Amino acid sequence: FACKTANGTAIPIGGGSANVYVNLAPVVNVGQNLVVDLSTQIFCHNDYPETITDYVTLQRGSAYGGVLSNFSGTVKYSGSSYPFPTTSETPRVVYNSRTDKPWPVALYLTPVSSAGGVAIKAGSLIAVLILRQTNNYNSDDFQFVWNIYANNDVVVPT
Ligand SMILES: O=C(O)c1ccc(C(=O)Nc2ccc(O[C@H]3O[C@H](CO)[C@@H](O)[C@H](O)[C@@H]3O)c(Cl)c2)cc1
């Protein structure tokens, strides 16, 4: 089991870290959601699907910077939504193919009442998402740590 990103980096068997750079909507209004879709950013596969079934969760999602100070919201993982920043580990998604498969995570972030002007700065860390991979074969339990950065400013109009 290993993963790759839309920025051309990887995390191998056994886990590790990577940076992810996301283009964000430049304007998000109060009462609306900024969508941060990681399924177009992070892709993984199973290295021995003939025998082994891989299981993958979002173990943890944390907010930083302007997201932490100016937004609330949720994370959608494989069709179900949960609070973000996270308060539990999600259910597992099965990876059962050598073919790349997106990691089905998206953040839905809404600006808090006090937000205005530039609410997320270009280049800033917005989130850390921890993917936890196990299987039905051995005792492997690996963390793939995704540091999510904004590629651009996000403004919340007054
Ligand atoms: O035809 C043959 O002779 C043959 C075929 C296959 C193998 C084999 O044993 N292959 C093999 C490949 C990868 C393996 O582990 C990694 O990938 C799995 C599946 O994603 C992960 O769950 C796991 O955490 C880890 O990342 C493991 Cl334990 C085993 C040996 C011999």
> Within 13 Å and on the Cβ side, how many CA atoms surround 58?
31
Bridge partners, 73 (sequence order): 109
Rounded CA gap, 6 and 14, in Å?
20
Rounded CA gap, 68 and 97, in Å?
36
- Alpha-carbon distance values, 91 to 34, 51, 67, 94, 127 (Å): 24, 22, 25, 10, 20
Burial bucket for residue 39 (CB in 10 Å: 0-12, 13-18, 19+):
middle
**Residue 51 CA, ligand 1 centroid: distance in Å:** 8
Determine the residue of 48, 50, 134 to mutate for testing ligand 1's pocket, defined as the one with the most ligand atoms within 8 A of the Cβ atom: 48
Rounded CA gap, 127 and 63, in Å?
4
SS3 144: strand
Cis peptide before 85 (omega within 30 of 0): yes
Q: Work out which ligand 1 atom sits closest to the CA atom of 45.
A: 20
Experimental technique = X-ray
- Residue closest via CA to ligand 1's atom 8 equals 48
Experimental structure resolution, Å: 1.0
CB contact at 8 A, 157 and 119: no
Rounded CA gap, 109 and 120, in Å?
11
Instruction: Kindly report the number of other CB atoms within 10 A of residue 117's CB atom.
Output: 10
Domains belonging to the chain, first-starting first, are 1-158 (2.60.40.1090)
Q: Strand 93-95 vs strand 34-37: parallel, antiparallel, or unpaired?
A: unpaired
**Residue 100 CA, ligand 1 centroid: distance in Å:** 16
DSSP string, 68-119: HHHEEEEEEETTEEEESS-SSPPPPEEE--SS-EE--EEEEEEE-TT--EEE
**Residue 52 CA, ligand 1 centroid: distance in Å:** 7
Q: Each residue of 82-113: b (16+ CB within 10 Å) or e?
A: bebbbeeebebbebeeeeebebbbbbbbbbee
Name the nearest CA neighbour of 20 among 126, 142, 143, 100: 126
Find the angle CA(57)-CA(58)-CA(61) to the nearest 5 degrees: 170
SS3 64: coil
DSSP code for 40:
G
Rounded CA gap, 80 and 44, in Å?
20
